[model samples]
Target: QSATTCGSTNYSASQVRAAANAACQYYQNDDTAGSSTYPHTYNNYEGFDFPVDGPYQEFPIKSGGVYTGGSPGADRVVINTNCEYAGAITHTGASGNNFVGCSGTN
Candidate 1:
């Protein structure tokens, strides 16, 4: 099977999301003349399918981790919660304080 990058990365979720959004909007070349194909679409993290304890907090997503639904009342995307630079598993960091940047506690 092939591999897919998700869960987390060296970049933050918002960073990655921004890149994806740009790819869909700017870099898309209409190779198909009459035919149609979906451009780079941005998928909401709503379908990410994870269990969130608090509102969607801005933490680094780790590889193999699952993103869950959150309260629209608070923040739709988990990354929008707090603008902390929490490094996820794949992101890589050390020290309890460093860990707390995004995760708050853990």
Candidate 2:
């Protein structure tokens, strides 16, 4: 299932899944996210109750397109290192760099 909205941005399932999988590849190989700081470790400091497990990774997912270097917008795709789709989150609602779950993630 794709997220209809992350904060206010809409994303198809394919976009979310694609980002998650890409992030997973990075996590497994200890690779970087394009030219960005992402595919970075997500600490889950938000305490969100995700579907899968933590040890999560965060990658920016833009409604315009999936992230590949450049700016990371506001939305993020969260996935386990095992490549499980944990959920979607965004920086839109939270303070600072913190995140809140998307529509169905929480």
Candidate 3:
């Protein structure tokens, strides 16, 4: 069998942090960036860090595929699953949890 064609992709920790912040701020609209001692509350912080476990495609896309600019409330949500989705997430585009599925035709 032949190996599947693959692409080398990478992102900075800071950029991901920023995307999480933006998504959180847009979707959550919290008050402050919760601390390790005082985790963020759903409405207050929510903890929705991107590319942590799931929704890897939701990660921020920056220059050279490196995003780095968002709120500081992406330290709450927990990603606990592996996904097969692939795409680049934007910083100043859309935000939310609403999802729709579509397939490409050959």
Candidate 4:
């Protein structure tokens, strides 16, 4: 079979994590709930965008906390620590989901 090509960008895993973390902090700091738990109520973190077509991707958050995005059944975003794929809390975003399907950090 000929070499197949997929429309996707090569982003370093570290960079992805950094982006995710930054988003987390942004939501965390802008909290109006007065809750210590950051992104506790489904907040959009402005960094790290996943693919949309096919071929899934996974990014590791070093601290291994809670991450959120779309529906778990559909093209959703998740947060897992040490290889454990856990469900992330959902939030609102430009794409209607906190973890949106896009290109990269912006």
Whose lDDT is greatest here? 2
Candidate 2 vs candidate 3: the TM-score winner is 2
Q: Which residue pairs clash in candidate 3?
A: 15-67, 47-76, 47-77, 48-77, 62-66, 62-67
TM-score of candidate 1 to 2 decimals:
0.20
Candidate 3 residues 16-103, lDDT tens each?
4444444445334323323322212222132333333343223332334223335422212221223222223221222474221111
The pairs that clash in candidate 2 are 2-13
- Tens digit of lDDT per residue, candidate 4, span 1-106? 1111112323344544453454445444554212333223322344334222212223222223323332222222233222222222222234453353423222
Could you arrange the candidates by TM-score from highest to lowest?
2, 4, 3, 1
lDDT of 1 by residue, 1-106 (tens): 0122332333445554543332233223422112222221223333333333323333222233222222211111132223221122222243432221223223
Candidate 2 TM-score over all chains jointly: 0.89
How does model 1 fare in lDDT?
A: 0.27
Candidate with the larger lDDT of 1 and 2: 2
Q: Which ten contiguous residues of candidate 1 have the minimum total lDDT? A: 68-77
Error of 4 at 26 (Å): 0.3
TM-score of each: 0.20, 0.89, 0.27, 0.27
Residue pairs with colliding backbones in model 4 are: none
On a 0 to 1 TM-score scale, where does candidate 4 land against the true structure?
Answer: 0.27
Q: What CA RMSD would you report for each candidate?
A: 14.5, 1.4, 11.8, 12.7
Instruction: Report the poorest 10 consecutive residues by lDDT, candidate 2.
Output: 1-10
In model 1, what are the clashing residue pairs, if there are any?
Answer: 50-67, 50-68, 56-78, 86-102
